[PDB]
């Protein structure tokens with residue numbers, strides 16, 4: 001049934017977990033909403049708003065005061081279990097915890113990690129090259145972010161195979177494993193690292209965040225658990241999705257493979273343009289004050305779902321948004337791939353470096369590649385949309 005403050009003409013049944021046609025094209029599936037009202041109420045998933053036009057997505061995402069990050073998701077209970085830091089915090093509390101995390105991920109540290117992260121991408125590329133084909137999502141995209149994670153926290157080289165296998169439960173969620181079991185599995189995986197780095201700080205990512213104060217006092221052990229869980233989960237599916245979309249683009253645009261092999265100096269600019277072009281992250285908020293938007297009122301307690309694709313790819317917000325082009329002069333902060341305002345991805349710098357290093361190694365090390373002739377590209381929806389299969393072929 002429809003709440004009184006929701007006009008009948010704003011009602012849709014859009015399921016954010018499986019948008020119609022999402023398996024063929026995630027972007028086209030979401031863009032169907034640009035043909036309707038800029039703020040719609042879906043009856044699916046318990047009933048919630050969906051921001052459905054660029055200016056609305058952008059405005060509501062940035063309103064951290066009236067639209068709280070506490071809820072995490074439209075699925076009940078998920079946020080209550082995960083308690084991510086800083087992702088789910090508001091206001092002064094959020095600022096106090098974000099501060100040391102952002103310090104940990106600053107550009108100087110990202111730049112210092114570039115050679116190690118490049119070596120990880122190169123090693124993985126070289127393991128696949130002799131085959132002449134791969135299932136890129138399962139053989140590369142879903143493998144790289146966990147390998148990078150182990151590098152970021154500097155695990156001993158000899159523990160990597162064990163730690164890589166332990167990690168597979170978390171990079172590729174299965175079921176029936178409940179949210180509580182997944183939280184517990186993540187914590188148990190992370191605990192030995194945290195214990196070591198809080199006792200004996202090194203110079204890795206965890207050590208550097210955990211040796212900083214929060215609001216002038218030490219991290220508690222539970223806050224460390226919550227923050228570390230956020231760092232692990234925040235960099236896994238998002239990076240896998242983006243790397244897959246970048247590879248899919250190149251496979252479909254042999255002219256861009258040729259361009260970036262001829263002009264490797266265009267890789268950074270191509271990484272920024274591809275990140276703008278293929279956003280797949282959507283977020284939830286819960287209203288803590290009434291919010292007027294697009295001629296309706298989101299009431300306290302209502303949930304709001306915000307798809308970044310409907311800012312970046314809305315022709316009303318950006319000109320010819322589906323063209324990959326180099327004359328936009330657009331700082332990455334001006335689009336919504338990494339979010340907006342107070343909660344904007346702390347890993348934004350690191351993600352850009354990972355995509356650049358991927359392009360350098362894949363293009364530099366691989367011959368010309370293409371989609372397989374008889375297998376399809378499939379995608380999925382949910383909060384982080386992604387390729388589920390990407391079959392590539394090349395002459396080895």
Ligand code: HEM
Nearest residue numbers: 086087234235238239242281283338339343345346347351
């Ligand atoms: C392609 C890569 C990535 C994309 C597209 C992405 C996207 C996003 C977006 C949209 C947000 C804002 C969420 C919101 O407003 O509720 C965010 C926040 C965040 N991301 Fe990322 N991210 C990526 C990579 C990473 C990496 C590599 C890490 C860390 C290893 C990371 C960790 C975080 C954390 C901790 C937050 C919470 C920041 C806060 O609440 O203040 N992300 N990310």
Ligand SMILES: C[C@@H](O)CC[C@@H](C)O
Nearest residue numbers: 072234282283284383
């Ligand atoms: C929880 C989901 O909607 C967003 C998670 C990204 C921001 O890491």
